């Protein structure tokens, strides 16, 4: 989740809580408020892709 597309060669390590709707979150991580840092499901039994 991010407000705007990243400018080339720009790194964004900020972990602020994303506000998808119209209610500001203020760091609560609840309904319509998400944590952008999604993990990866890396296991040896995955497919090639």
């Amino acid at each position: 989740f991010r407000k705007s597309n990243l400018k080339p060669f720009e790194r964004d390590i900020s972990t602020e809580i994303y506000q998808a709707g119209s209610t500001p979150c203020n760091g609560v991580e609840g309904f319509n408020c998400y944590f952008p840092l999604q993990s990866y499901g890396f296991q040896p039994t995955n497919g090639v892709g």
Partner: nanobody, 119 residues
């Protein structure tokens, strides 16, 4: 996205007119609302208008005072006040959505939100 106009200091008993203009929405298959902001407290609901204006609801503390209307010829709707009590001086927010909801009082049921009117 939702540019709105109107607002200002009032004579505490006169009338005022507020507008909210959609610049990137068809406005013919969308449903809007009016919500109120007060510092130090949560967001409040005031008014709501459906498609065209044939099914409109109002808050229990505002019923009978303010009138809502919409017109597709300019992609905007008009909210007119008639009392302007010295207790309703707050921040005005214009919302919109594709459809109308049964939980139309909930703020989460309005994906689109506009700018703010003068406090």
């Amino acid at each position: 996205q939702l540019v709105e106009s109107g607002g200002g200091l009032v004579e505490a008993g006169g009338s005022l007119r507020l507008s909210c203009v959609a610049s990137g929405l068809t406005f013919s298959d969308y449903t809007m609302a009016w919500f109120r902001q007060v510092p130090g407290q949560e967001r409040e609901f005031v008014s709501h208008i459906g498609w065209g204006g044939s099914e409109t609801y109002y808050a229990d503390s505002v019923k009978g005072r303010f009138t809502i209307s919409r017109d597709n010829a300019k992609n905007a709707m008009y909210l007119q006040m008639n009392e302007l009590k010295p207790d309703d001086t707050a921040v005005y927010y214009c919302a919109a959505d594709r459809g109308s909801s049964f939980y139309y009082v909930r703020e989460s049921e309005y994906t689109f939100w506009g700018q703010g009117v003068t406090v």
